[PDB]
Every structure is written in structure tokens, then in C-alpha cells.
Amino acid sequence: GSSGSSGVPMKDHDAIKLFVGQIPRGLDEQDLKPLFEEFGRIYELTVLKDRLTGLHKGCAFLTYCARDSALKAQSALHEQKTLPGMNRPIQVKPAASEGRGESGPSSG
Structure with a gap:
């Protein structure tokens, strides 16, 4: 056993x-x-898969042991990397308080 x-x-x-x-x-x-x-x-990585069919829906939940880790990997991967076979980049957001989410653009 390594790193724990x-x-x-x-x-x-x-x-x-x-x-x-x-x-x-x-x-x-x-x-x-x-x-x-x-x-x-x-900290934890689970993949979301259908039920009736069980075919990979195309999403997964990633958790980080530390707060920053998420911030970086988030703003570091969110529309930054492009997985193989995906015309568009990878979308990663802080799965939380989805109901109400405040955000706004900014120049610079």
C-alpha cells in the first residue's frame, strides 16, 4: 500500500x-x-450510467479531498481540455446548489 x-x-x-x-x-x-x-x-470518482439499458450516459461525478484541488482542476479543465472523440472540450462544474446559481461575465 502506497500513499495511504x-x-x-x-x-x-x-x-x-x-x-x-x-x-x-x-x-x-x-x-x-x-x-x-x-x-x-x-477522493471519489463515480461514473453515471443508465438503468433500463445501463449504457454509459456520458457523465461522472468527481470529488477532491481538498477545496483548491477542485478549483484548479475545475478552472483548469473546464473548457480547457479536449478528450479523444469529443469535438467539444470537457465541461466540469461544482455539482452543488444547482437550483439557484448566481454568475456574471467580466471584461479583461
Whole structure:
């Protein structure tokens, strides 16, 4: 066991669960960890798959043990990287308080 391998993982009290909606078909959490591991250590990675059919819907939930880790990987991947087979870049947002979300553009 390396980098831990003791028991259950520990996250931050103010952590953030990021959500990706640019996951093609044929890959898995094992192919996403590599990239997410470029910013820091992951806490949890689950892929969303249909039920009736069970076919990879095309999205997954990524969680970071630290707050910053998310901020970086988020603003570092969000419309920055382009997975293989995806004409468009990868979309990653802080899966939280979706109901009400305030945001606005800014020059510069």
C-alpha cells in the first residue's frame, strides 16, 4: 500500500463535488483519474450510467479531498481540455446548489 492504503479516505469539511458532462463511450474512472490526478489526489470518482439499458450516459461525478484541488482542476479543465472523440472540450462544474446559481461575465 502506497500513499495511504490504510482505511477510509478523508475529505475537506468545505470540499466540492465536481461534475463532468463530457465523458465519451469506452473509457472509465481509470481513464479519468490520470487527468484528475494532474491537479491533486482524488477522493471519489463515480461514473453515471443508465438503468433500463445501463449504457454509459456520458457523465461522472468527481470529488477532491481538498477545496483548491477542485478549483484548479475545475478552472483548469473546464473548457480547457479536449478528450479523444469529443469535438467539444470537457465541461466540469461544482455539482452543488444547482437550483439557484448566481454568475456574471467580466471584461479583461
